[PDB]
C-alpha cells in the first residue's frame with residue numbers, strides 16, 4: 001500500500017564519529033530525512049546491541065527517535081531522528097555562554113528528557129552539550145545511548161559500579177565510591193551543562209580534591225570564574241545541583257520547584 005518509499009540514499013556526511021560516522025539519509029520519493037549512525041563492528045557488539053536495545057524503549061519529544069537498524073554483514077546502521085540544528089555545543093559562545101532565556105528553555109527541555117529516561121529506568125550516563133542535539137525549531141533532544149544502562153528493573157533500583165562518562169561532567173561519587181546511585185549522577189551533569197550554557201566555560205577538569213577549581217567551589221568562592229558570570233538566581237540553583245554528597249544533592253522534582261527554573265524570562269514562539 002506504500003510506494004517505493006524506503007530506499008535510503010546517503011546525501012551527505014553530518015560528521016564524525018569515534019565509532020564511525022553519521023550520514024544524512026534521504027528517501028528519494030518522500031524526501032524523508034533521517035540520520036544514519038554507521039559503526040564498524042571490526043573497529044565487542046555489547047556496546048551497540050545494548051545501544052539498539054535501549055533505543056527501542058525510547059519514545060519522547062526531547063529524546064532522539066529510533067527508527068530501526070541494519071546488519072548488512074559486519075556494519076551496523078542505526079537510523080535516527082534527524083536534528084538539523086546540530087549540537088547545543090555550537091550555540092555556546094566561549095567565555096560568554098548564551099542569553100539566559102535560551103539557556104532556561106534548553107534546561108527545561110533537558111529536564112523533560114531526563115525525567116522521562118529516569119521514569120523508564122534508563123540512565124544516559126554521558127550528558128553533555130555535544131550529545132544534546134537541536135531540531136529545526138531549536139528543540140533539544142538527548143542523543144547517544146551507547147553508554148546508557150538500566151538502573152531500575154521491576155521496580156528495583158540497581159546501583160552503578162563502573163565509571164563512565166566524560167571527566168568535566170562526571171559527579172564526584174563516581175570517582176570516589178565503588179557503587180553509587182544513577183540519578184544524582186545525571187543531575188550533576190545537567191548542572192555542568194547549565195554552567196556551560198550561562199558562562200561559556202567548564203568549571204573544572206574533574207570534580208576531585210586534587211583540583212583547585214573544584215576546591216574553590218566547595219569553599220564558595222563564587223567571585224571567581226565561571227561563577228561570577230552567572231546571576232544570583234541560576235547560581236542558587238547551581239548551588240543545589242553541584243552538591244558533593246549525592247544524598248544531599250537536589251532531585252529533579254525539587255529542581256522543577258526552583259525559583260530560577262520557574263522565572264518568566266522568554267516570550268512565546270517567534271511566529272504566531
Ligand SMILES: OC[C@H](O)CNc1ncnc2[nH]c(-c3ccccc3)c(-c3ccccc3)c12
Pocket residue numbers: 014015016017021022023035037064080081082083084085086087133143144
Ligand atoms: O550520535 C547519535 C546521534 O543520534 C547521531 N547523530 C545525529 N543524530 C541525529 N541527528 C543529527 N544531526 C547531527 C548534526 C546535524 C547538523 C550539524 C552537525 C550534526 C548529528 C551529528 C552527526 C555526526 C556527528 C555529530 C552530530 C546527528
